[PDB]
Design a protein around this ligand. Structure first.
Ligand SMILES: CC(=O)Nc1ccc(Cl)cc1C
Length: 119
């Protein structure tokens, strides 16, 4: 529906489903195991992963698509900080998936901002 302030919840649910099914999401699907990777929290202030984002959305704990968008960007910016080398296949995966996410989210954001002006 045009001007729907609730539309972003279904749009983000479906975009996350597409991300999970994409091979480039593999490293970012679940929280980093800290006892497996002991220096992760030395580098990363605020861990984030797509399972946390999906669970937060399904629980209704995002107020806006901007909030969900901030958490997804944190996944990609954490990857660039932990895996900064352009040689890394993981660097390449987060680059491709970030570009994919940013392409889909832009219209979710602008539709939401239109809907909120209307409301
Ligand atoms: C989300 C994240 O950066 N995870 C990760 C990536 C590459 C390597 Cl080699 C190890 C880990 C734990």
């Amino acid at each position: 529906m045009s001007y729907d302030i609730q539309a972003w919840k279904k749009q983000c649910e479906e975009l996350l489903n597409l991300i999970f099914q994409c091979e480039d999401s593999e490293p970012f699907r679940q929280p980093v195991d800290l006892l497996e990777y002991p220096d992760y929290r030395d580098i990363i202030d605020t861990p984030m992963d797509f399972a946390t984002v999906r669970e937060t959305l399904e629980a209704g704990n995002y107020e806006s698509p901007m909030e969900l968008c901030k958490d997804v960007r944190l996944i990609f910016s954490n990857s660039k900080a932990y895996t900064p080398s352009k040689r890394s296949r993981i660097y390449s995966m987060s680059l491709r998936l970030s570009a994919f996410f940013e392409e889909h989210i832009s219209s979710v954001l602008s539709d939401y901002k239109s809907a909120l002006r209307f409301h």
